[PDB]
Design a protein around this ligand. Structure first.
Ligand SMILES: [Zn+2]
Lengths: 143, 143
């Protein structure tokens, strides 16, 4: 199936009444305009967005009576850094930036891919963190 | 006057009853152990700390009946970046770190030396900021 335009967006997964056949992509695939991969259920998808569109987490690519094909990034090993203060957030975020390490700052959490070499640094800053599995839902803006 | 050990520390300037003859130093001079400079009133000071001491903002070097010689960093042109949320703080701090720009994150503010080239970046992140004059009171930890 060739997709040239997004046909919807999942704002709330719990309200979805159709089965979702996810097209799992990499974090790096967000904001992209071209992609070809098979969905979980094996449907071949060739994305070539026209206009100025850019793939977003939750974007709906196709919808049938009982199924929806939508985009989500893969579940991966990460560190969920949780600063308790504005000062902790600023100092921790600064150190991650200084190391040029990609991350997503959502609300009061700092999400980065699992890398043990960061442990000494996070402890050094003295911020609470844990290893877990998460999906990166926002494109990393290489500013 | 040769100083080999700190003799006190100004915890609260308003409670000081003696006149203070400040030894104004550079931000980079903090945490240092050796320094030679004249105080505002012209007193020659040669600092050569023994032990493991490191010059701190507010450190008292000498005290007479009516005067105190103490350390403070100079008043300089800066940007006082003020994120309103944890997310703003994290994203702004990250970008400053990614540029390897020295700063001090105190409470909910990000203090950096004035550099117009940062304006586009701060606006890009969309955080409120202002140009002003401040003293850096904590050593920059080159981690
Ligand atoms: Zn670099």
């Amino acid at each position: 199936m060739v997709i040239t335009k997004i046909v919807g967006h999942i704002d709330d997964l719990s309200h979805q009444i159709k089965k979702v056949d996810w097209l799992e992509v990499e974090w790096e695939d967000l904001n992209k305009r071209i992609l070809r991969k098979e969905t979980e259920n094996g449907t071949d998808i060739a994305i070539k967005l026209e206009n100025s569109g850019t793939l977003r987490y939750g974007d709906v690519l196709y919808e049938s009576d009982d199924t929806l094909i939508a985009i989500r990034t893969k579940l991966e090993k990460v560190y969920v850094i949780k600063p308790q203060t504005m000062q902790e957030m600023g100092k921790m975020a600064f150190e991650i930036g200084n190391r040029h390490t990609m991350c997503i700052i959502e609300d009061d959490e700092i999400l980065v891919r699992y890398d043990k070499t960061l442990e000494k640094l996070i402890d050094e800053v003295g911020v609470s963190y844990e290893q877990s599995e998460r999906r990166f839902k926002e494109p990393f803006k290489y500013r």
